[PDB]
DNA sequence: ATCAGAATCCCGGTGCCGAGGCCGCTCAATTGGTCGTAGACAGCTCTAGCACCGCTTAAACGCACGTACGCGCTGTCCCCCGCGTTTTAACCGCCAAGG
DNA sequence: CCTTGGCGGTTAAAACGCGGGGGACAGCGCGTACGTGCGTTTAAGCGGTGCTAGAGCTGTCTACGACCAATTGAGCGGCCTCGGCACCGGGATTCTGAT
C-alpha cells in the first residue's frame, strides 16, 4: 500500500503529521498539501542539523552523535543559532571562547 | 501503553546524510524535542495566518508563509524549496 | 537552608564554563540569590501544571512546559 | 628550590578551557535535588518528582547560570575589570529584563 | 468591525463617573483586552491539550490566570472569576 | 429575557467571549463557566488600569484619559508593569527618570 | 535615506532615554541599528501582506510582525 | 517614510503603505531606540562614564541577544 | 637566552554495556467510497493611495571657540590566588551490649 | 552462637590562612571634541488639485476535504550481540617560571 510519504518522496510521516494537525486544534479544516509541506520542512531541518552534528562528531573522531555535537553544530551555525536562540540543549555545554583581554599579556 | 516518536524517521534521515554515523539515545531525545518544537511553531503561526485572513482551512500556503516568518534567510529558502517540491510531487 | 549546598567551587565551575577568569568574594551569595529566584519561578509553574493535572508527582514534562512558557525552551526530556 | 607555583590566573585559564570543553553538570546532584524539593515543598506539600524532572531542572538552571556568567563577564570587562562583581550580574540581569 | 469600546466605557463610568477617554487611549485598551484574551485562552488551550481534555472549562481559565498573572493580580482576578461563575450559576 | 453578563454581574460581554472562544481554535468544546470566568478577569484588569489611569488624568487636571495616563498608570504599578513588560503603548512616552550620577551637583 | 534620520532626532531619542552626553560616533551607529530593526519588522510585515494577496501594507501587518518579534504594540488595532 | 519604503522595496516590489502602518512602524522604532538608549546609558554609567559610546550600544545589544 | 619540573598529549589495552540488530503483535496509517460547504474564479466599485505644486519658516547645515571630559602616565594599598593545612560529609567496618 | 548498636578508618570534596603579586582607584597632566552660539539656507509641513490601483464586496461554480466503513504492515515492545572508548598504565611534548 503506497503511502503519502512515499508519494511525496519523504522519510517523515505525512499521515502522522496530518493527524497531528487535525487534532492539534489549529484550524477547522486542513488541506491535503499542508501535512506534506510541513513534513518536508521538518525532515529538511532535521537533515541540516544531523549533517552539521555528524560533521562535528567526525571531527572528534567519534562515530556516534551526542548532544555535545548537536550543540557544536547549532552554535557554530549562524542561522541555526538564530532559530534556536532561546533553546537549551541538555548536556550540550558551551562553545570554547575566551575573551582576549583575559589571556596573558 | 504505546508511545509514538520521530525516532525512526530521524534515524532514516541520519543514515541518508551520514551512512556510517550513529546517535545516542539522549541526542535522539533532543532531536525529537526539536521536531516537536518546530512543528508547534509552524502549525501555530499557520493557524494565526488562517485566522487573520478569515480562512477555516490551513493549506500549504499557510505552512509556507509560516516557514518564511519563522526561519531565517537561506534556511527559509531551502525549506521552502523542499516543501514546494514535496507538494508538487505528491499531487502528481 | 539547602541553597548553601550550591557551594563556592560549584559556582566557580559554572563561572569558568561561562568564561570567568576572576571572581569577587561577594559573587557566590549573589549567585545563590539569583538561582533561588530562578528556581522559584520555574518550579512554581511546574507545580501549577502538576496541580492542574491532579497529580502528586512533578513530571519532566511539567518542568518542560514551565520552562517553555518562561521562554526557557529545553530540549531532551520529552521522552 | 622553592616548590612550584603557577601565577594567579594561569590555573583559572586552565579551568576555563577544561570546563568549556566538557558538558557534565557542575552542581552536585544530591544537594541540587534537596534544593529543588525544598523550594517545591514550599508551594505544595508531599510532592514527588520523576528523576528526569529534577534532571531537567538542573540542566536548565546550569545553562541559565552559565549564560548569565557570560554576560556578567562582558559587563566586568566593559568596565575595564577582569573580576566579576555583583554590579556586573545586576547590570546583565537588568538589561535582560530580569529586573 | 467589533471592539470592547462600550464595555471599557461602562467600566470606566463605574470607577470614574466623571472621567472620559481619548480615541487613542480606547484603542490601546482594546489592544490590551485582546492581548490578555489571547494569552489566557492560549494557555488554557495548551492546558487542555496536555491533559488530553477536549473541553476548556473555568478550571483551565483559572490555572492559566495563575500562570500568566503576577501575585496580587492573580489572586484578585481568580477571586473575580470564581465569584462571577458562582453568581452566574445561582 | 436577561443576559449572560447581567446574570454574572459583569459589564463585559459573556456571549461574545464565549463565541470568540468557540471560533478561536482553542478546543473542540467550551464549558459554560469558561467565558464567564474569562470575561470577569478581563473586566477586573480593565477596571484596575482605568482606576489608576483615571487617577493620573485627574492629576493632570484632565477629564479624559489619554495614552500618557495609561503609560504612567501601568509603569508606576509593579505588577501591571510586569504583566505588560513586553508591550509598547503608542504615544505613552516613558516615566520621567534621571540617573542620580547625571545630576550636575 | 538613512541620513534622513538626523543627528538632532537621535539626540532627542537619547534624551528621552535619559542620556546626558553623547559621543560623535553614536549617530551612525544608531542608524545602523535602526536600519536592522526596520529590516526585521518590515520583512515580516510584508510577508503577512503578501500572504493576504495584497499590495498594501496595513497597520495590522505591522502589528503582527512586531508581535511575532516579541515587540507587542498597543494602539493600532 | 522614505526610509521605510526604501527598505521595503528590497523585500517586495510595488508595495503601498497605509499611513497607519508607517505610523505603527515609527512608534515601534522610536520606542525601541529609546529603550536601547536607556540600556546604553546604563552601560556607560557602569563604565564610570556619563557619555554613551558605540561600545555601550554594542554591549547592550549583545546582552539583549540582538 | 637557558634548564628543571609538572601539566599535557599521546601509545597499548580492555572489557563492558548500551546502541544496533532482530523477532513477534496490532493498531494506526492506508484504501475506497460518499456528502457538502468552504474554497476558487470573474466582475463593480469608489475609497484611499499616489503624483504634482504654491507658500511658509523653523529645523537643518556650516563655522568660532574654549574648556572639561576622555585619555596617557604614575603611586598605592588591598584584594583575590596558589598551595599547604586542616575541615567536614559519607560509606563502610568491627567489636561490644544484650538475649 | 546469633542479632543489633556505637566510634574509628578511609575517600572525597571543600574553608582558613599565609605569603604574595599585580590591579582598580585616585591623582596629575595633556589633548582635542563638541556644546553653545551665530550666520545662512532649504525642504518638511499646510493646503490644495488632480489622477487612479486595487481591496472590499458581490456573485457564481465546484471540487477537495470531512466523515465513515474496510484493510494490513511497518511501527512498537521485548530481547540478543558485540565493538568504541573512559579509564588505566606508561612515555614523549611542552609551557613555565626563576636565573
Residue numbers in the entry:
A (entry chain c), F (entry chain g): 14 to 118
B (entry chain d): 32 to 123
C (entry chain f): 24 to 102
D (entry chain e): 36 to 134
E (entry chain h): 34 to 123
G (entry chain b): 25 to 101
H (entry chain a): 68 to 133
Provide the publication's sentences verbatim.
RNA polymerase II (RNAPII) transcribes DNA wrapped in the nucleosome by stepwise pausing, especially at nucleosomal superhelical locations −5 and −1 [SHL(-5) and SHL(-1), respectively]. During nucleosome transcription, RNA polymerase II (RNAPII) gradually peels the DNA from the histone surface without histone dissociation, until it reaches the center of the nucleosomal DNA (the dyad DNA). Conversely, in the histone chaperone-independent pathway, the histone transfer from in front to behind RNAPII is proposed to occur via the formation of a template DNA loop, in which the upstream DNA exiting RNAPII rebinds to the histones within the partially unwrapped nucleosome downstream of the RNAPII. In the present study, we performed cryo-electron microscopy analyses of RNAPII–nucleosome complexes paused at a major nucleosomal pausing site, SHL(-1).
We determined two novel structures in which the transcribed upstream DNA behind RNAPII binds to the DNA-peeled surface of the nucleosome. We named these structures RNAPII-nucleosomeL40 and RNAPII-nucleosomeL60, which contain DNA loops with 41 and 62 base pairs of upstream DNA, respectively. In both structures, the upstream DNA is sharply kinked at the DNA exit site of RNAPII, and is folded back toward the downstream nucleosome. The upstream DNA spacers between RNAPII and the nucleosome are 10 base pairs and 23 base pairs in the RNAPII-nucleosomeL40 and RNAPII-nucleosomeL60 structures, respectively. In contrast, the nucleosomal histones in the RNAPII-nucleosomeL60 do not directly contact RNAPII. Therefore, the nucleosome of the RNAPII–nucleosomeL60 complex may be more flexible than that of the RNAPII–nucleosomeL40 complex. The upstream DNA spacer of the RNAPII–nucleosomeL60 complex is 13 base pairs longer than that of the RNAPII–nucleosomeL40 complex. Consequently, the nucleosome orientation relative to RNAPII differs by about 50° between the RNAPII-nucleosomeL40 and RNAPII-nucleosomeL60 structures. The DNA-binding surface of the proximal H2A, H2B, and H3, which formerly contacted the DNA, becomes accessible and captures the upstream DNA. The length of the upstream DNA that directly contacts the nucleosomal histones is approximately 30 base pairs in both structures.
